[model samples]
Target: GEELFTGVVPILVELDGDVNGHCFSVRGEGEGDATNGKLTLKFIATTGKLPVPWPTLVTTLVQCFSRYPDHMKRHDFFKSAMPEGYVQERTISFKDDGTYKTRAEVKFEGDTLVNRIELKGIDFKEDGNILGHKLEYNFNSHNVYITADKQKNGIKANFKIRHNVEDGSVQLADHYQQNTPIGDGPVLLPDNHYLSTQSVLSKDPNEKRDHMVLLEFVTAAGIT
Candidate 1:
């Protein structure tokens, strides 16, 4: 099989202004022949979270920088919330039958395991001149320990995305359903832009908080 295309897609979860999330890449290579009409997708990440595949934080930084109008004491309070130089790259190969499922967990302190996430979905098939994918994921956590603000949260939903081989454009939008919901549906994403959704992440009936999930397209290097 020949390598067709590969790229790291940044997945960010922003609570109000503080961002906590990671990056994961989906690599597509030829299945058998050119006429097979399908490609294999490799899911790459760290143990639990794929934090910043590239310098995606720069964009978030820019937004935070704009939060303050004055230059005297303007600083991003959430800077330390995002880790630095902690890049952990791990690759998970594909399975037979062109379908996939993989899971990872993130623990905290000596007690309770905080977060567990999984990526399981179908194959990437040729859709006219573009590629289409149907993905299902479950982000379960006993507590929101990843961010500075603490709360209990969970997400279960299936999101869809399409990539254009000729031109580098992506179509994906829709918030992670359950616990809260944001956005209407999938829409065309601009270059270097992200499609996002916002919902409530609070477990307490007396309180309500905003949680967001963002998706961006980053093309892989050295693609023919």
Candidate 2:
């Protein structure tokens, strides 16, 4: 037997921007078929943070860039925080079944970035605790309505940035909701947690070429 629902809509994504063209922006790219109808993303660096999705970031960056008199300098700084952080050409397609596929590969520098993620759910019975499933769902905070517990679905990402430019990566894991709490409930979702971190790859002066250390945590998964 199959559960048939007619009004099924697709979760789509869009991404656009080019540092060379003096255009700095990130928009909805693709994939969010998860039933919870929500996605949370946060990019951190020395310059600033991008804690919203494509659509949200687009409008936000416009207002944000105005504050920097030297916009180019800002990007220069941005480049440091995220060197050459621009998109040459990419695709964004958010499906309706909770899955995503994308790519960002540079030819000259041998740079590349590829990622995939999904959000899913199971059931609800009679139980209450202090973690996911028991966590409260908040749609007002991150423009998303969660249906599962604290981060628990699908997130697979891999990247290779220049040794000196950047060394960041994306991954998926449980939304460990014990140490932190927000609003009135937990912060985990059914699809899982999307986490990205940036850190020093090394300190040895002899190693002219060091990498950016990659880890798993949004706030305190363990950088200390």
Candidate 3:
């Protein structure tokens, strides 16, 4: 049922009050940094207390909140640097030590088994400080392989894991990469290698090297 507005000479409707830690929500569309076209850009941030204004036009809610009074303040610095990728999802997670951890993930576009990559804030952590950086290209089809064990900072991870996902086969990549400090910063350098007569696979390059190279192969199934 819709009601028509039949107002008199002066119908004043207004209210004012203090918003102590007030929270608000809204749904609308606009275009900016991360839009494709006809951008309806759906978004949500219930944990925000940025003082949403009154009415979509003239505007501004409830005053219920939990811990972390400076929630929005901390998020403010990151708002302007979000992504346009299809899987731009952020999640708050917990750790075994009863601490809260957070991370975001992005994905292969509007589209496969040989899809894009999945990433987390930091897969490796150690002694009080931080560790490293890397880039990867992986696929699954006929004969496939995965690479990581890339970096370990603040900690010396002597042994590493290697695998063939399709078959669940596993091996160890020893003397993986040295976290040798170069001046003020630390970097990974090939410390050693011991895989030649074992299998041609072991002798294949990039088996824990510090340089980038071009490699190509059909995904484990047979497609490029």
Candidate 4:
């Protein structure tokens, strides 16, 4: 059975100088042909920055929207802690030359908060082909546990992959380990493994060798 549903709808809002503006859009369709379903996104941004840096602004907007949603409400914390008007947003688009096209945006709202961001385009192969279907990646650790004692802490991190190539071949990759300091005689419970990249590879036979890497970290602590 096939099911259709709306995916992530990302919205970006920013304040530049004395003007404030926002962009709204949705990605992925809720209904479509089963065989040729398309994932599309619609975005629109409005601002009064003369000679608006569209590319840079768009990047900043997207990055703020995608931040660890939990900390988003703490706007004041960021403004005073970071440099003045030093907020940023960025997105990376990979190119055939193994290089990346990155877009970023930066601005400040009032005197209390600044914003910056990044926007990422889908990666493609040299043959003018898209390289993924269900793409998933993480920039931080996925698993964390805390003990009763605050004196001890443990951490781990890793990457994972799942891709579909042509000829019914499926490619899978993963990295699960700790990249942080482990406490002495720390309860060597189980290894903290991170599973990130889980995506279907491009169906184009020529794009079978594409690779995606993700970074992650994990930490745990016990009460002293």
TM-score of each: 0.21, 0.16, 0.16, 0.24
lDDT of each: 0.21, 0.20, 0.19, 0.24
Candidate 3 lDDT, tens digit per residue, 95-195? 21111121112111221001121212223232211111111122121211112123432112122223222235332222211111213332222222211
- Mark the 10 consecutive residues where model 2 has the least summed lDDT: 59-68
At residue 123, what lDDT does model 1 achieve? 44
Q: Which candidate is the best by TM-score?
A: 4
For 1-224, candidate 4 gives per-residue lDDT tens digits of: 00111223222233332111222221211111112212122222333212222221221221111111222222211112222222222222222311122222322233222223333333334343123232222122222221121232322333232223343543333323221111233222222222111112122244232222111111122211
Models sorted by TM-score, best on top: 4, 1, 2, 3
Which residue pairs overlap in candidate 1's backbone?
A: 23-50
| Predicted model with the maximum lDDT | 4
lDDT of 4: 0.24
Better of 3 and 4 by TM-score: 4
**How far out, in Å, is residue 92 in model 4?**
4.5
TM-score for candidate 3: 0.16
lDDT, model 4, position 115: 28
The deviation in Å at residue 196 for candidate 3 is 22
